[PDB]
Antibody, heavy 218, light 204 residues
Framework: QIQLVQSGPELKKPGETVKISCKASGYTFTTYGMSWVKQAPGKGFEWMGWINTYSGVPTYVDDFKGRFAFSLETSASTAYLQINNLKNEDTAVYFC????????????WGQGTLVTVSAAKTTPPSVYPLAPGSQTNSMVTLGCLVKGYFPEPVTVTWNSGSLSSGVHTFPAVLQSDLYTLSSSVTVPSSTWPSQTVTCNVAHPASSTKVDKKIVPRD | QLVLTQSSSASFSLGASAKLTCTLNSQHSTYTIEWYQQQPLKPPKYVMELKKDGSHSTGDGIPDRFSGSSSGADRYLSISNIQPEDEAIYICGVGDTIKEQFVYVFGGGTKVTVLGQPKSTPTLTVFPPSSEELKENKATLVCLISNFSPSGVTVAWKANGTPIKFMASSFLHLTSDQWRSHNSFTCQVTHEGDTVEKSLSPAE
């Protein structure tokens, strides 16, 4: 079945360059052309043009002549978009889209890659444990506070993924230009504190990984 | 929005018929259009091609409740017995040639919400500031809101009883001094017009 999988979000300063990828599977790569479509915050979809996956010839829409380069690694069934001399107005989600038969231009889409053009600095999260002091026959809710990070995302697991039942990881909240997130887990007493419970927090943008054993008190 | 015009929002009762409109300008009155669906965290999906005479072809994995029809320059997407999973932004698209060159235009998109869904009320879990944060002179109060449906909640914080499924959360960023100097704080959650609350007690 037909999937286009795009690369992950980028944060870049004005003037810099970014290259994002779109990996295809489920069909013959050179049979259909690949388009790119820009969605800027607060605006609708804008077609950027397409590359002929057989001939290698790209066609650019007017707004996209000069700084944008479409390219291919056909051995890898991958299409690439390179944007040079980044401007503030390049901030957008960029989608690849495959054509279809009988003149469909946008039959299958990738998930989008957010490109942020900003002078904001990458900030690691501070991580705090959320725990009670250690009544009989009650369920205990533990948590993990992940505060003040940029850009998104952070990921959270518990006991390296082996504790999954009772886990809620909640969507991130933007406040004053930093994100905060929390995760909780409800465990039976008496499994805690007799059995250990750790939250594991990764922020790939800052190359950070934090583990926090949850112990009784406050 | 002049080649293609779409109203930016629409809403329909659960299980009712839904009808969305995309209107073409006079220069493109007879053109065929495509409909797309955009939901968060997923690729956008090609829904259908719709011709001036009202004939159409769908899918994708597009269910039989989606259909199209036409009237002059208007192009309609219809959803029969609309379901909560049909909530999405629906975008219309059209192709053309302008002096020798191929051009494609997308509409501004219509955000569709499905009203009158069965309600599941939220459960709240609150956490006080951790001792680690308090040692740094900071206090974040946490209110986690889970097991509710449908989507959409509003959160207000109270201090001393006065102002100032799906998942949601709210954080109140205080200093350690502000935390220690109240008798209580309260996270108040409004869902489909009903209220649920839970409090934290700096004294405990």
């Amino acid at each position: 079945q037909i999937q286009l999988v795009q690369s992950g979000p980028e944060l870049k300063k004005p003037g810099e360059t970014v290259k994002i990828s779109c990996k295809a599977s489920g069909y013959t790569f050179t049979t259909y052309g690949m388009s790119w479509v820009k969605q800027a915050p607060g605006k609708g979809f804008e077609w950027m043009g397409w590359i002929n996956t057989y001939s290698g010839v790209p066609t650019y829409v007017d707004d996209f002549k000069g700084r944008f380069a479409f390219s291919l690694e056909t051995s890898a069934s991958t299409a690439y978009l390179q944007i040079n001399n980044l401007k503030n107005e390049d901030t957008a989600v960029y989608f690849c889209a495959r054509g279809g038969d009988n003149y469909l231009w946008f039959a299958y889409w990738g998930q989008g890659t957010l490109v942020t053009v900003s002078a904001a600095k990458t900030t690691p999260p501070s991580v705090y444990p959320l725990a009670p002091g250690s009544q009989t026959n009650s369920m205990v809710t533990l948590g993990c506070l992940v505060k003040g990070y940029f850009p998104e995302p952070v990921t959270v697991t518990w006991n390296s993924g082996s504790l999954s039942s009772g886990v809620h990881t909640f969507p991130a909240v933007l406040q004053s230009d930093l994100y905060t997130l929390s995760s909780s887990v409800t465990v039976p007493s008496s499994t805690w504190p007799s059995q250990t419970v750790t939250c594991n927090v990764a922020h790939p943008a800052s190359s950070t990984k934090v583990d926090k054993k949850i112990v009784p008190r406050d | 929005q002049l080649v293609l015009t779409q109203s930016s929002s629409a809403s329909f009762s659960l299980g009712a018929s839904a009808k969305l409109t995309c209107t073409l300008n006079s220069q493109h009155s007879t053109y065929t259009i495509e409909w797309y669906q955009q939901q968060p965290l997923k690729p956008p999906k090609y829904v259908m091609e719709l011709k001036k005479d009202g004939s159409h072809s769908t899918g994708d994995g597009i269910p039989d409740r989606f259909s199209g029809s036409s009237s002059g320059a208007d192009r309609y997407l219809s959803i029969s017995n609309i379901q909560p999973e049909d909530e999405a932004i629906y975008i219309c698209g059209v192709g053309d040639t302008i002096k020798e060159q191929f051009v494609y235009v997308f509409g501004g998109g219509t955000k569709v919400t499905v009203l009158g869904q069965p309600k599941s009320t939220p459960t709240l879990t609150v956490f006080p500031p951790s001792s680690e944060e308090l040692k740094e002179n900071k206090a974040t109060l946490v209110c986690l809101i889970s097991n509710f449906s449908p989507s959409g909640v509003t959160v207000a914080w109270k201090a001393n009883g006065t102002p100032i499924k799906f998942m949601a959360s709210s954080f109140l960023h205080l200093t350690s001094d502000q935390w220690r100097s109240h008798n209580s704080f309260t996270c108040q959650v409004t869902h489909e017009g009903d209220t649920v609350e839970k409090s934290l007690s700096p004294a405990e």
